[PDB]
Amino acid sequence: NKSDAAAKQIKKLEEDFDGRIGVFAIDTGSGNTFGYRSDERFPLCSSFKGFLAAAVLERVQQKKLDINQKVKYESRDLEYHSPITTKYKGSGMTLGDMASAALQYSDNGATNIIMERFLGGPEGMTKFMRSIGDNEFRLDRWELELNTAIPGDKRDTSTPKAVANSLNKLALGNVLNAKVKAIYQNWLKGNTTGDARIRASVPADWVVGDKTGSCGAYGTANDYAVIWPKNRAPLIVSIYTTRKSKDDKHSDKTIAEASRIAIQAID
Amino acid sequence: NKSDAAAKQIKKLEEDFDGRIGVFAIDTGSGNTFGYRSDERFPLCSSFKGFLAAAVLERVQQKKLDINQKVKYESRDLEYHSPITTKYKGSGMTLGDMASAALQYSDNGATNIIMERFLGGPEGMTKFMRSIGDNEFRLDRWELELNTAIPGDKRDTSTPKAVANSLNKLALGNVLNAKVKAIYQNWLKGNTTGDARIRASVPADWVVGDKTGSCGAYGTANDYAVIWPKNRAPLIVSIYTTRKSKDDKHSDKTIAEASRIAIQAID
Ligand SMILES: *C(=O)N1C[C@H](NOS(=O)(=O)O)CC[C@H]1C(=O)NOCCN
Ligand SMILES: *C(=O)N1C[C@H](NOS(=O)(=O)O)CC[C@H]1C(=O)NOCCN
Ligand SMILES: [Cl-]
Ligand SMILES: [Cl-]
Ligand SMILES: [Cl-]
Ligand SMILES: [Cl-]
Ligand SMILES: [Cl-]
Ligand SMILES: [Cl-]
Ligand SMILES: [Cl-]
């Protein structure tokens, strides 16, 4: 009944704000899961940047790239919302610094630079996800056009379950070695954009790493997280939302409440 | 929960002054530790000069340099805050005297001279730290640019834990031989800049060697110390702080208080 009760609550919440909520959560201790619309497609928005950073780290661990190599872009016309890359344009940034900027500040210049030079574009990003056994994720376009969030459009989408599974494999599993995995975890823990979302759904003293997305159309926003509860095995939580109308604004509170519901469902 | 109690106290202290405090402390006699934000990055400021001095001593021990060789610089335009090098510009200084000046007086001319001629610049300084198994420390720039302490900037940072571990290895461990280690200890014991920080958190008759950092922007300041309590095995304490606003001044009192808290946490 517990799963059906949680589903009832998400359904009401999505109706309350005239939109659509997709959830997948895992208690990695018990194996218990909860899903709601967990196989439906939602726009990725900036959330894919969390996976981009993991792809960089994999290349680093395979010795194909060096985390400390200098990335120069002195001549580049920086994309909108490049707060970190803008500041270091004169000096360059290390590959590590650029990747973590993409994740923690949603820096679009950092994102496009990495895809152009190191990852093989949206195709290469998709191939990375295929390489870890994620068959749902697809990135089709570059920043910022990947953020259109048009209803029914399959471009630049994944599913809540596929996102949760991939995050589990990357942040907690075997894809990255112990050393590089710890770097990835630290990057997620230092994300700056997620304070009103999954982070808002758990006690102050639980440790959270997350990445958000906020397309800026169709009230489309999301969050995924690895949560370390005090003295317990970690949780994985993946929350994706869309809204009916183009001009609808996203709802952080809806995301946080859906997170609260999912966490109880697997408890 | 003695750890949890101490964490609550540091958290409150950082909220009190609208900033961020990172702590790592070791009782070398029991191996007990306490950490708070101990894996987060903080600007090194002048504190790296304590490690620069150790790097010089290692070169001396390897017979790549002589502690008494004359270092001349009669034509040099000395960096701001070079009180010791300024006084011997006409005659030169011994390598040992120059290195101890860098540590005990935060002499910027001493610092840059040593990095230019003997250590291979910021890259060589970083290589030294890597050579003792410190994987977090990074020096990217020269004096005085390394002191900008821009929020979110990873240049010229380390973590409290890595700083404490490295200080343990250098001041108390096996990197330097018994003879050269004694010189390093004496240099730290004679630091002149740390009276209001870790030194202020222990009794007058405990022996302390330390190095401070005071970036001079973003209320960014720090201290690390080896402490010999009367009749007890030595302690290692590492305290790093930042503040929210550019014009915020550093807080010696907050550093001293965080040190008091850390020392109790491990006792
Ligand atoms: C990512 O989806 N971004 C970047 C930025 N912050 O990331 S968030 O914390 O995840 O929201 C806000 C804008 C957003 C977009 O680039 N959206 O594009 C809107 C029109 N293309
Ligand atoms: C070491 O931390 N510093 C900080 C200094 N900037 O702080 S400021 O001088 O107050 O602006 C730059 C280099 C180095 C020192 O020279 N330290 O001594 C300066 C006075 N505490
Ligand atoms: Cl960052
Ligand atoms: Cl989209
Ligand atoms: Cl805080
Ligand atoms: Cl010698
Ligand atoms: Cl020189
Ligand atoms: Cl130089
Ligand atoms: Cl700095």
From Swiss-Prot, chains A, B:
One of its GO terms (molecular function) is beta-lactamase activity. Class A beta-lactamase which confers resistance to the beta-lactam antibiotics, including penicillins, some cephalosporins and carbapenems, to JM109 strain E.coli. Acts via hydrolysis of the beta-lactam ring. Has penicillin-, cephalosporin- and carbapenem-hydrolyzing activities. Induction: Up-regulated by the carbapenem, imipenem. Expression probably regulated by upstream promoter elements. Pfam families: Beta-lactamase2 (PF13354). It is an enzyme of class 3 (hydrolase). One of its GO terms (biological process) is beta-lactam antibiotic catabolic process. Belongs to the class-A beta-lactamase family. The class A beta-lactamase family has a specific amino-acid numbering system, sometimes called Ambler or ABL numbering and often misspelt as Amber. A multiple sequence alignment was used to derive a consensus sequence and then the consensus was numbered taking into account insertions and deletions. This allows use of identical numbers, e.g. for active site residues, despite differences in protein length. UniProt always uses natural numbering of residues, hence there appear to be differences in numbering between this entry and some papers. Coiled coil: none annotated. InterPro entries: Beta-lactam/transpept-like, Beta-lactam_cat, Beta-lactam_class-A. It comes from the Bacteria. NCBIfam families: bla_class_A, blaSME, classA_carba. Keywords: Antibiotic resistance, Disulfide bond, Hydrolase, Signal. The keyword Transcription does not apply. The keyword Hydrolase applies. Disulfide bonds join C45-C215. A beta-lactam binds at S46, K49, S106, N108, T212. This is Beta-lactamase SME-1. The active site is at S46, E145. Its EC number is 3.5.2.6. It catalyses: a beta-lactam + H2O = a substituted beta-amino acid. Partially inhibited by the beta-lactamase-blocking agents, clavulanic acid and tazobactam. Not inhibited by EDTA.
